[model samples]
Target: HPETLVKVKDAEDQLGARVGYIELDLNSGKILESFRPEERFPMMSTFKVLLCGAVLSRVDAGQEQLGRRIHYSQNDLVEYSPVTEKHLTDGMTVRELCSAAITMSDNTAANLLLTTIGGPKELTAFLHNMGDHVTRLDRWEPELNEAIPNDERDTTTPAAMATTLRKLLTGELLTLASRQQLIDWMEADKVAGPLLRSALPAGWFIADKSGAGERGSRGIIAALGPDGKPSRIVVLYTTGSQATMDERNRQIAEIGASLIKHW
Candidate 1:
């Protein structure tokens, strides 16, 4: 077990909110440390990773091609989105959409991929078979703009997301090529933020995705530790009206730093 559980617990206390987190030992397939790993929280943009996995699985099965063209028009655009902000032209390929979705957290890209994967019900079914019983996709990006109860939004527990990442990284859920592609997308993702990337040693391999909203922040980072000595996965999900971004992110960064030092 990792020796940083106390530090993690302390950070959780300091945050003083509803936060669910879990860290796993990749080699042993055991949870290294956790608090409320089973508690479900809104997935927000973090759902993009699972959406990416769903599309990748289709590719692996020969049902889809990443190079296949997908078009976007003004009708597809959502306000305040990077896709619209940058004025991405119409007629992008699925590969490009997935890249934008993962790397830039583009809302339109995510909605397009969600549609390409046959929508939320399809993805939820896939996750259920993978043992992520609590995860679900209840709405699309456009729908996310309106206020909704937490239980009605896309939801996943910290443990479920971490386990999903483990399966994706270990080739249990995707072919080797597909697995690497997903990891590459995550590694290239520019949105992981300092919560997961702030305290890593140089040369460590980190692949991750993150989500933030009026509720709070959520993210997962998997690292092959420096020299690959103690590869681990850390996941954190928080939701509270009172938690400021600085306080929430600081707690997550502190937890990540503690794990990197001792795990």
Candidate 2:
């Protein structure tokens, strides 16, 4: 251990704000670093990972297929959805929609996927099966950023998220193929590199997710060393602060760099 706590606190101090975070050694199943790690924060787009798992559960139960195509209506079009930027008026497969959701943070695609796997309540039900009481998907995208109380929106604790990722990686929740595909989707995410992957050394692998919310940014990172095995799992959730977006990202990036250096 290379003074993980000191480095993490230094990163937080550099931001001049509070942050809820946890870094777990997946191989040993021990918390390597933390700061208010049990605290809850708005999940923002990061909830898409839970939604994806919820839908994957349906797939595992033979209720749905990833290749299933869904029609795209004008009503599905939401502002800030990157899927809309592609001028896609026809339709998209469930896999394609999920790709857009995770990779592009497409609001419309996420909503459609939520509807495909039931709804917010159903997603909550799925989380319950994992013993995750603090995580909730109260609304779909766009609605998440609307004028709603933070408690009424999607929320999760860094500890809850860390447990969720541990289950996913350890084959406790999803099937092998589903887990592999989920990892693939996360690896392909277009937006997470700056916060998580940017600090990683070459040949190290990270399957991660990033979200920008009404308050701040949340990042979930699962890292594997060059031997192609689990190394560490990290969750960074920040909100309700005066830091600019750039400042927040810098804090996350520096934290990431510190973790890599110590790993």
Candidate 3:
């Protein structure tokens, strides 16, 4: 077994959560470390990153514009829509929507972007089109966050998350401008970025998204760097824990600690 597997198992035991993770060498497309990588876990808000990728694909095709305005009424609001809930009167630009969705984990913004790309099914189809068969989107936010046990809806494997993210952010699946824009959104994350990035060694640039929901589930997908390039892709997820968010995050960071040590 890999050295990191011991670390991941320890994290799972300490946190009372089933933790799954994979760290990939982005440039070479090799799996450097993994533990239960194929196990599915609720994606929670992590879907917003891929959601925006689909939107950017449309932007690259000239069918959609980031600057384009999208208006929604108060009825559009949902739980945890900090940004979109405030913009009921004046519509938000698509770029702002993406920013709100990623940076704030705004549920309404995610749903808007989800609908923009033709809802959860289309997002799953987009993943399939991109060759990711294990990741799937089945519902909008709030309901998606239910995260009932044994429920497969709206979940992704750590392996699939890392695979899709490595290609979408670094490979040629998107135009350079589009890829950069998506990374910019991921980099601006306030929910998962601050905590995960803090655990890494200084100077390792990272762009990531985090998702949290029922059952104390929290997960982060990220691209980390050493040579001014995000050459490492890491996906980490936890579920079935009663631990507080801060505690779960602490263990996740500890797992990160093991990563740097292993390398």
Candidate 4:
């Protein structure tokens, strides 16, 4: 847990990007300072953090198995997919699916995990039971987003997501070993690059999950690096400016790197 507040004023000044932030100490549920903590936004893949929790809970309850094998046939293929883009044939373990869903943002893996476990409704109910009112998962379809109703589409507040991640990190949702597995998978995630991951100091470790939509991108990240101090950081960013996606991503990464060095 961080002892000092991560000076948000300095972050805005140095990064030129004012963001919604949340940092929690999992051991105590401590709120380390935040900017617009209660504000809600499109969740994108950040919602997968909760999905991972809900799935792990099911596994702990003996409702699912981590080694369960899921096959990906032609019917399971949605639209254009990077997993399928190169023409692949594979069946992944539940554990591998969990890793791919967060690390690679593999839609096929997510949908498979969703079906093998319970669907979004069950996951939503699990979160509600945990007293999180602002985080909801109506669906995870990437392309047909408008098909979802305003109230039904996935959305969450920064604080709510942070709280959920805190529980998982502290082993409140599953056993300590399970939580560790989740974190390991997140840190090994293959997606959401050119942002937080791109900005970290060389060899600085980060176990994070990120979400991106047409509007913007957001992430939940935790790290304990060579400095040996653990930091939990949450960020949500969006823009209508002229910067291209690459430019915006670079700025986001630079901001994160600076935060790791100074926050």
Candidate 5:
């Protein structure tokens, strides 16, 4: 364990960044390992997973329907809205929007779902209702990703994120169907590349959502199943680094490699 911590420190030094990470054993409910697990970092696109959950909760209540179509024009497009930009005319179903938000991290799709659940404040309230006091969404897309140093807006800690993921995925927060839907979307994530995915062995299966922001902020939240079941969940975030995204990703990969090696 000490060796792993030393490697984490070396990683931070190499990137000149602050790291926050947590590994949770899903079945035993234990925090297997972490570094600054309680420190905050910009959530960026990683928040989309929770956004999808919030929408699923509505569907569970019969207040929303995944089959219902919502329209957004070209004016709704944001800077990073690859998926939503393609469906401006046809619109997207709630389920389709959730898929775009999680699998592609589509900014416009997330904002659409965010507003459907009410807004940033409502999503924060959803987390509060779920008993997560620290993870909050203070702004909408683009602005929410400022990732400013010392700023806490639109941020969540590694511990908070990991705990909430456990609750939503394996606990009673959502229906079984809803939880499975979320997992399926995460498993289809197109944004996860050379992060933790690169460091994993060939037999391991991963479902993840990734985020990147200003000031060299990046994060990944994943359900990792070395076997067929998701026995482990990992949350990793890095901030305040001027390094390239590739460097930050490789450093995080190094941390992930250590976790698997020592587990």
Candidate 6:
């Protein structure tokens, strides 16, 4: 069991966050620590977890092969995907595209995968049917950073992210081999934001993704950050405030660093 309320209040007071946080030990499907873990907000790039599940579920169910390829164009992406634009225009395999989307946070690759999985709704339904209440897929077409009102952002919660990730870590999200593959891809991710990565000692094997917008920011940094051994998966998110990107990231890192030292 976790000190759920105290940690939640502390996170809200110190960080000025309409916040959600969870630390999950992978060895069992249990919450080791938490605060407002179920409160919702836009998932940001963390929605890519559904995108990953979309592909892997197909592979697991034998409906599609992971080696199948998806071709890309310059039109498929926005500001975040130099790698896929340069290397994947003609196309890449399913596994490769997944890596590009998840590991690199390649917007172009993510869009392609989303399209391949029947857009966001199908993926959303797929995730929701799996028993995640706080995660939902929006029906509107996604236009990154197009000056949307605060209320229109896509929603998710820290508990949902931890739930999704715990399933992935526990082999409940995919087949045994496929779960390992997913973690491997997550570990190899190129999108490093301070939330999870900045919290650990140098060279700790942590995997994470981050997204920033006009009014708020979001990220999930999970994996081992202990000095000499693997640690539990900890998922954190924020909303309701705006700050410079570096400052926000530094705060997440600082919090993570303190968590590793103290817990």
Measured by TM-score, the strongest candidate is 5
From the highest lDDT down, the ranking of the candidates is: 5, 3, 2, 1, 6, 4
Candidate 4 — number of clashing residue pairs? 2
Instruction: Write the residue-wise lDDT of candidate 3 on 16-133 in tens digits.
Output: 7789989899899999888888899999988899999999988998989999999998888888999998888889999999999998899999988898889999999999999999
Question: lDDT tens string, model 2, 197-244?
Answer: 777777787777788766444455454554455477888877665567
Pick by TM-score: 1 or 5, better one? 5
Output the lDDT of residue 165, model 2.
77
lDDT of 3: 0.87
lDDT of 4 at 106: 71
Mind giving the per-residue lDDT tens digits that candidate 5 earns over 18-57?
9887888988879877899879999999999999999999
Which candidate model has the greater lDDT, 2 or 4? Answer: 2
Clashes of each: 0, 0, 0, 2, 0, 2
Candidate 6 residue spans exceeding 4 A from truth: 1-15, 139-153, 225-231
**lDDT by candidate, in order shown:** 0.75, 0.76, 0.87, 0.64, 0.89, 0.68
lDDT of 4 by residue, 1-263 (tens): 22222444443444444355676655566775566677665676666667777788888899878898677787776643465323345677788778777877777667777676578777788889887877877775564132222333676776887777777766466888788888788778777677777766666667877765554334445533434334554555432223455655665575566556654
TM-score leaderboard ranking:
5, 3, 2, 1, 6, 4
> In candidate 1, which residue pairs get closer than 3 Å at backbone N, Cα or C atoms, i.e. clash?
none
Quick one: RMSD of model 6? 3.1
Which model is ahead, 2 or 3, in terms of lDDT? 3
Better of 2 and 6 by TM-score: 2
What's the TM-score of every candidate structure? Answer: 0.90, 0.91, 0.95, 0.81, 0.97, 0.86
Task: State the displacement of the C-alpha of residue 228, model 4, in Å, after optimal TM-score superposition.
Answer: 5.7
